[PDB]
Amino acid sequence: SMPRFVVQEHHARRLHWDLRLEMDNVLKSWALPKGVPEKRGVKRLAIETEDHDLSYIDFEGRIPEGMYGAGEVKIWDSGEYELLERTENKIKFLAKGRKMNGEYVLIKTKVGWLLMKA
Numbered sequence: 001s002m003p004r005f006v007v008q009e010h011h012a013r014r015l016h017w018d019l020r021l022e023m024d025n026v027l028k029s030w031a032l033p034k035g036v037p038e039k040r041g042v043k044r045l046a047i048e049t050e051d052h053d054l055s056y057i058d059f060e061g062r063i064p065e066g067m068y069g070a071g072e073v074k075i076w077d078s079g080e081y082e083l084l085e086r087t088e089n090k091i092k093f094l095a096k097g098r099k100m101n102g103e104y105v106l107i108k109t110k111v112g113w114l115l116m117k118a
């Protein structure tokens, strides 16, 4: 297998959360400066970032200083997910995490991305 996701909490110069989905055989990734929306209605900024390799999904530890992405990475949540809709501008999925669960949607507009919870 079932596709999985991870939300990493990243203590970098700006403390943020990275949402990564196993998708297109890579980790499709977004930085969430204010984290995952925890209830319906909440609209959180999602910043599209570079694909990561699948093996990074279980990573925890310190990215060293002077490297792009420096800081401590921990797993904030993780689980399988079921993809429900996908186009170049919308990704809707059922998350099976311990914190992030139920349906969520990533949307792309001319100003970037947003993450919302059903």
Ligand SMILES: [Zn+2]
Pocket: 010, 012, 016, 017, 018, 031, 069
């Ligand atoms: Zn990060």
